[PDB]
Design a protein around this ligand. Structure first.
Ligand SMILES: Cn1c(=O)n(CCCO)c(=O)c2c1nc(Oc1cccc(OC(F)(F)F)c1)n2Cc1ccc(Cl)cc1
Ligand SMILES: Cn1c(=O)n(CCCO)c(=O)c2c1nc(Oc1cccc(OC(F)(F)F)c1)n2Cc1ccc(Cl)cc1
Ligand SMILES: Cn1c(=O)n(CCCO)c(=O)c2c1nc(Oc1cccc(OC(F)(F)F)c1)n2Cc1ccc(Cl)cc1
Ligand SMILES: [Ca+2]
Ligand SMILES: [Ca+2]
Ligand SMILES: [Zn+2]
Ligand SMILES: [Zn+2]
Ligand SMILES: [Zn+2]
Lengths: 53, 106, 207, 666, 677
């Protein structure tokens, strides 16, 4: 229904953050360098994760 | 204006107390027509008095868009707010003459 | 913000197409009678304005004002002075009504537009990000491209309890904000003068 | 001395301590002490009744700013010095001025009578009381008046005369006085707005005040249109005439606030889409398909109404939307003819019947349409619209092309450059350019491109105002380059002279080539070696190079970005309210196509009792309108208003007077 | 038909006696409410705890309508108090002491205690009373902590935990609590602003509240400095240390308190310290200022050697003035740039030598200055830490320039010791050519350091600062440009690279007399599409030497489309975005320039680094300082709370609550009079 104010609310966005980050809710707690190398090290071995799923 | 009922004006001033005493008296507003309704009545009211019909529709959709009337008489106020915002945006697309008012109510 | 901004460009290019179409018509009417062929070679020559699509091609590259089309394309091969000069005046008028006028008008329009979007910018970005997130929230297709009832009544009752609580809290917050935000007007002063005068008249009547 | 001594150089009047106690008790709103003070003032005492503070606060004036009706009645009872305190009661906006009506320096101008200040304060009850007492305002002179007495008064005191005229025009432009005293407040608002605009044009000083007054009058007219609540009332107002004659008057007087009214636009959209419902409700592709099939079938509806006017196909041209669609279909057909005309080898051309013979009458129909426009409006209406000027130069070029073709008929690589065939072809090309640029004026009908075109049209003036300064800079640098570079004018061995060659040379030899080269230097189309002479004089080459550089700096870096900044500010000021301007232009287009004349496109056009009834109907409906309007401004003025210091002073002084009255009673 | 309106949320409308009770309560009549309570002692339909569906009680209305006698009367009659104390604190009513000592849809978060709401309301008297009674606030955890309690509360109730943390930090960041309970409100304000900035960066939700809280703490510190009225108070504030130092000023510069440093009094003290021993340097004609700056710039080596010989000398102490020290450092850098500019021009030798021997003209004079730069950058890496080094982009460019100079020196001595013939016969990767190019890039990096020297000037320092601000947004948009460039470059390469030709031509690539093989490889395509923004790529690069007209047309169409994008869409978007960015940062340009100029000033304030770049190669005192700081800062806190209360009485604001307050008061007075008379 294109509700811009409903979804930009802090509570709704926070719930979306907790659903989006999944198990590692401390990914936001990690520093930016650690987030970068975590994103990289998932980006390398992605076919392994897809095949193992 | 002559087309304004007391409950429509009560929703216009958006007071919760006036609403919660007025709807105790079994009050129902007229149902506005669709986005492109051109039935035997709707094609005749535009012929009869276009400005009066447009002001009546604007008054009804300002009465329904008040938060007090949404929060009092509906099963789900969030769903009513969603549907009313979508309907008001569609009417502002259709009604070129009152784009600011319908956009403000949305 | 750029994705919201693209509609302004749509309108501006809608006007620019008509301006370009006018001059292309004028130039290909003026230069119609008078190896490499066309404009895409070293010696650009007068063959740019011979064809209609060639004239649109030549007038397409003039908008950057960076020597994309050299001005010796406006010189007749037959050496007629007045037709060549009128063609030069026409392409100069094109380079005035665009580049100098239309492009800077576009810059002003974009300046006002980006002043307008920038206030509702974070909300729009969060909405689009949430749209992408809910597109990726499904269990419908988890693999990458290469691999590629009383319970309803109980839920409605729980939702009714939560929504009744929310309606109560929002009513209290709305009346709190309303009583803490509005400013006193002259009519409230008039009610206060009325209460004072009613005091004075009741005092005079009683005494 | 290291200390600045302070003293009152203008000591003014001083008061006795008893007089100060009298004034302070009046400020407190006291019954007993003030009454006793005036009672001892009746007998020979120090206390004078007409005590004036050095702040110009007499007890009369203080009680006026005190608003206590009992106190002001007490002061008028024993005959205090009534000076300008009536005007103070007018300024304070209190209905208690009727008591003064029933009964040294001045803070106001000597011209200010009570009615002028009442109209300035814009209180309906006060102006009603003043005109019920019987009051005539002074007559202002005309906007281009010629009076010997008024000229002599200007020679005596020009300042007082200009302030007098400004005060009179501010009194007349008040909405309450217009609604209370004028026969036709819409006509009065229109004429007063036009008079104030011409007065601001004539008086370059005090221009902001007159522009504010004119905008206030236009806002009053728009509000009086807001108060309507029926299409019958709109049809009474807009069709009133002493045909939408009042809407024609609003168009002529440039009332963009009146014209862009949502109710007026509702009536205009109803009249434009004559018996054509659901056009906006239907799909965009569907409505463009209907527009395309009406415009494609244009000759069958335009042949009708020429032979059978009462036929339904003949009456299909009666609808103004169909008329506009037929006209634009005719114009795209004319441009299609021009396109095929663009797409032999004779000294004089026989008339090319295949595509270039049916253009001749269509141009003749265009000339007849412009002549009909010339008859309807005179010379100022035609020169007022820039598009009529563009049409005039287009038809002039087409007529010159026809005349040159005829001259060639009665009289390549061999003809003189002044052959009528070549000049005729060039004039036809420029006329084609103008005729195809004519399409950009049809964007006012569209909603997406309308405000765009109108904003461009009214920023063209700022563009020209910048281009004048650019012209001066261009002329200066071209004169310098001419003086420097004209001793090296090459004459031998040049296969091509000028900047328009494969090898650029002789760029700055003459003035005309210098103007062309400095124009083309903006777009980077003039190479750097045009400043290198054949000789060895490297100093003059360097001076020419640095002169070219400085020009390029001034044009590209400085003046072009200054134009960008000026366009930014101008487009901000224009797109603040460009929607009303766009709706005004669209109404002008619609009402130009509402007329019974010009129903044929340019292809095929080559009683006292009734007046009394209309007057009474308009009068009754506008009594209703002014009643609603005064109710609305009374309601609005009662809310969203700051109380400020005066309301607190009144409210605190009422409690003080109440406390003193209670202490007197008990 | 008609829309039916049935009230879904069913609330009891109570007894008419209860409505009369409520009406007597807001209406202000003391007699009717007392009579109603006496009637309510017999336990008929009126109840003392009647709750009105709007969400008000008689006690709650009495709280909202002041009249402390009414709350005393109701509290004497056992009215239920669930959150009436909390509504009293929210109402900013000082009559909450009656609820303090005498006697879920709660319209409040369950986290909120009285002290949290008291600090939220920012009322000095209420917070003072609550702390005097004895109340404490729960301690928030670290901004980045993985302790068991935080993650457990997040898994149980994430929204409740986040709102609780936000309310705790909003209570701690109140100016009144900080001014009343924190022992060091300057350090507390600095640390709280820093912690709230880290919370805004980490928690992307609730970011606006966190940056508003940080701005409020910076506002509090600025106002606290604005309440000073003497020079000794400023000196004892700025020189205070935890354990001429300006330690608090260093710590405030570290914590990025912009408006703290840009305060006029701190600027006055720093300008007094900057022009040390100067009889009105600013009170001078600008021509005299120019010539005197020229003559201190010229006599830089004599002051340098005077400091090296005799530190106690007046000329040896002349360099210790920070302004003269800055002038001499700028003179050293300008002489370095002049030496490089002579190195470009004085060189007139064969320039053919195979190894390029180091001349005595400019080399061995550039070399020391280069290693003095290296030693200075090593010292600034050690002193102040690595984070302060990488915070400034200017130090990063200085490190890059020093690395390039070291690489040039290494390549030159490698060419001296190895591979020691016409110039055209040299390989493209010869060590001397690499040394030449690296020296050139180091020179274009060294001659841009004068822009960093421009923060001291008043006329253009804010301009340079604003350009430094929006350079980040420039890079922000250049990322999008890089994406467009990669897209169109690899598309055009995928089109034209089947048509690669050599033909034994003299030059290949775009940088020839006639452009050829522009879109041949990916590197050449990226270079050719980059240069097309500036119009230096002609239109004859799009056609192929063969007669494949369709591929030529679609290549010219792709090239024209990219030109349309990167020359109409993206560049004008960049102009509009720059317009809005400079409109936003025009107001904050002055405080940013003052902060940057004070950082540059305090770079030269330290004892170390006095020599320029040629020559770079107790408890009782603590208790006395603590007591002086405590008494001065107590005076500051008292002045600030007095000024804040006075401004609270000064702000032009009157809600509809106060008109209702006056109406209820005058009605109560009238009803008392009618009861008596
Ligand atoms: C349209 N046009 C043109 O086509 N040519 C080329 C003719 C053959 O080369 C021109 O030389 C040419 C031209 N308008 C020209 O004056 C301008 C005035 C104001 C603005 C402007 O616009 C902009 F600010 F520059 F952007 C241009 N000049 C220069 C000129 C030439 C002759 C004379 Cl008498 C006076 C002035
Ligand atoms: C006007 N002018 C010029 O004509 N020439 C061409 C001369 C013959 O080629 C130049 O080279 C030239 C020039 N102004 C120049 O410095 C500018 C300074 C600041 C702004 C500016 O403006 C803009 F930002 F660039 F727009 C230009 N320079 C560069 C220069 C050349 C030699 C020397 Cl010693 C010093 C500076
Ligand atoms: C993308 N594109 C392009 O690549 N070429 C080069 C092709 C080989 O030369 C063109 O000539 C070309 C082109 N778009 C063109 O119309 C525009 C549409 C939208 C924007 C625009 O520009 C701006 F944004 F307003 F500035 C220009 N034209 C001109 C044209 C040519 C032939 C015909 Cl039938 C119709 C139009
Ligand atoms: Ca016309
Ligand atoms: Ca450094
Ligand atoms: Zn219907
Ligand atoms: Zn006169
Ligand atoms: Zn923790």
């Amino acid at each position: 229904y294109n509700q811009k104010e409903f979804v930009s609310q802090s509570n709704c966005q926070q719930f979306l953050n907790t659903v989006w980050f999944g198990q590692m809710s401390g990914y936001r707690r990690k520093p930016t360098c650690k987030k970068i190398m975590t994103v990289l090290t998932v980006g390398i071995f992605w076919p392994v994760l897809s095949l193992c799923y | 204006t002559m087309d304004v009922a007391p409950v429509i004006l009560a929703a216009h001033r958006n007071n919760y107390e006036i609403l919660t005493m007025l709807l105790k008296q079994d009050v129902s507003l007229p149902k506005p027509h669709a986005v492109g309704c051109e039935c035997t009545l709707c094609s005749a009211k535009n012929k009869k008095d276009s400005l009066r019909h447009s002001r009546f529709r604007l008054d009804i959709y300002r009465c329904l868009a008040s938060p007090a009337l949404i929060m009092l008489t509906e099963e789900d106020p969030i769903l009513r707010a969603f549907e009313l915002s979508a309907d008001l945006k569609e009417l502002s697309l259709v009604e070129v003459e009152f784009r600011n008012d319908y956009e403000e109510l949305a | 913000s750029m994705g919201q901004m693209l509609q302004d460009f749509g309108k501006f290019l809608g006007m620019f197409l008509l301006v370009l179409f006018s001059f292309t018509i004028g130039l290909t009417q003026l230069y119609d009678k008078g190896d490499c062929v066309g404009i895409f070679c070293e010696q650009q020559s007068n063959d740019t304005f011979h064809s209609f699509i060639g004239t649109c091609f030549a007038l397409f590259w003039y908008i950057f004002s960076l020597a994309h089309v050299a001005i010796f394309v406006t010189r007749f091969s037959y050496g007629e002075e007045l037709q060549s000069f009128v063609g030069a005046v026409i392409v100069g008028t094109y380079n005035v009504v665009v580049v100098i006028v239309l492009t800077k008008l576009l810059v002003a329009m974009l300046h006002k537009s980006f002043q307008l979007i920038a206030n509702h910018e974070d909300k729009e970005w969060k909405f689009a990000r949430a749209k992408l997130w809910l597109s990726y929230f499904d269990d419908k297709c988890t693999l990458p491209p290469p691999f590629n009832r009383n319970l309803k009544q109980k839920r409605d009752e729980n939702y009714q309890k939560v929504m009744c609580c929310l309606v109560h809290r929002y009513l209290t917050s709305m009346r709190q904000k309303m009583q803490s935000t509005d400013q006193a007007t002259v009519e409230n002063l008039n009610e206060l003068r009325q209460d004072l005068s009613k005091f004075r008249n009741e005092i005079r009547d009683l005494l | 001395r290291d200390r600045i001594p302070l003293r009152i150089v203008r000591a003014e009047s001083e008061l006795s301590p008893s007089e100060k106690a009298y004034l302070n008790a009046v400020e407190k709103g006291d019954y007993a002490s003030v009454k006793k003070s005036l009672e001892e003032a009746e007998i020979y005492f120090k206390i004078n009744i007409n005590c004036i503070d050095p702040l110009g606060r007499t007890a009369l004036l203080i009680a006026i700013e005190n608003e206590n009706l009992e106190l002001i009645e007490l002061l008028l009872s024993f005959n205090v010095y009534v000076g300008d305190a009536l005007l103070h009661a007018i300024r304070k906006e209190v209905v208690g001025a009727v008591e003064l009506l029933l009964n040294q320096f001045s803070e106001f101008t000597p011209d200010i009578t009570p009615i002028i200040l009442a109209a300035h304060t814009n209180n309906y009850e006060i102006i009603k009381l003043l005109v019920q007492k019987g009051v005539s305002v002074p007559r202002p002179h005309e906007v281009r008046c010629n009076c010997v007495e008024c000229v002599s008064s200007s020679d005596v005191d020009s300042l007082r005369h200009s302030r007098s005229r400004l005060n009179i025009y501010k009194a007349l432009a008040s909405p309450s006085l217009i609604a209370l005293s004028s026969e036709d407040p819409f006509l009065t608002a229109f004429q007063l707005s036009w008079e104030l605009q011409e007065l601001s044009k004539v008086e370059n000083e005090f221009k902001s005040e007159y522009e504010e007054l004119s905008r206030q009058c236009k806002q009053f007219a728009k509000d009086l249109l807001d108060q309507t609540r029926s299409s019958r009332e709109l049809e009474i107002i807009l069709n009133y005439r002493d045909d939408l004659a009042r809407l024609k008057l609003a168009i002529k007087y440039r009332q963009k606030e009146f014209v862009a009214q949502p109710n007026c636009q509702q009536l205009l959209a109803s009249r434009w889409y004559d018996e054509f419902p659901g056009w906006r409700r239907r799909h965009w592709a569907v409505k463009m398909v209907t527009c395309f099939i009406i415009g494609l079938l244009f000759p069958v509806f335009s042949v009708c109404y020429l032979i059978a006017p009462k036929s339904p196909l003949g009456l299909f041209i009666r609808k103004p939307f169909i008329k506009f669609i037929c006209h634009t279909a005719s114009y795209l057909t004319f441009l299609f003819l021009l396109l095929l005309a663009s797409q032999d080898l004779n000294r004089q051309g026989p008339p090319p019947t295949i595509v270039e013979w049916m253009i001749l009458p269509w141009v003749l129909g265009f000339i007849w349409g412009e002549i009909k426009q010339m008859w309807d409006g005179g010379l100022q209406d035609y020169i007022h619209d820039w598009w009529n000027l563009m049409d005039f130069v287009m038809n002039s070029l087409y007529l010159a092309t026809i005349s040159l073709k005829i001259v060639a008929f009665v009289k390549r690589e061999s003809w003189d450059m002044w052959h009528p065939t070549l000049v005729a072809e060039a004039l036809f090309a420029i006329a084609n350019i103008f005729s195809s640029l004519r399409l950009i004026s049809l964007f006012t009908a569209n909603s997406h491109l309308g405000p765009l075109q109108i904003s461009l049209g009214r920023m063209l003036l700022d563009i020209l105002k910048f281009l004048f300064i650019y012209c001066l800079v261009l002329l200066a640098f071209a004169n310098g380059l001419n003086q420097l570079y004209f001793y090296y004018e090459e004459t031998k061995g040049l296969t091509c002279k000028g900047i328009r060659c494969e090898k650029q040379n002789n760029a700055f030899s003459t003035l005309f080539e210098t103007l062309q080269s400095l124009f083309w230097s903006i777009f980077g189309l003039i190479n750097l070696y045009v400043t290198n002479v054949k000789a060895q004089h490297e100093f003059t080459e360097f001076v020419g190079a640095t002169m070219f550089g400085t020009y390029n700096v001034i044009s590209l870096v400085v003046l072009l970005n200054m134009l960008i900044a000026m366009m930014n500010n101008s487009y901000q000021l224009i797109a603040d309210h460009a929607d009303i301007e766009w709706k005004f232009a669209r109404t002008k287009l619609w009402m130009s196509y509402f007329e019974e004349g010009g129903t044929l496109p340019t292809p095929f056009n080559v009683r006292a009792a009734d007046n009394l009834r209309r007057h009474h109907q308009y009068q009754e409906v506008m009594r209703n309108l002014v009643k609603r309007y005064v109710a609305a401004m009374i309601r609005d003025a009662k809310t969203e208003e700051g109380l400020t210091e005066e309301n607190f002073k009144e409210l605190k002084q009422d409690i003080s007077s109440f406390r003193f009255e209670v202490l007197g009673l008990l």
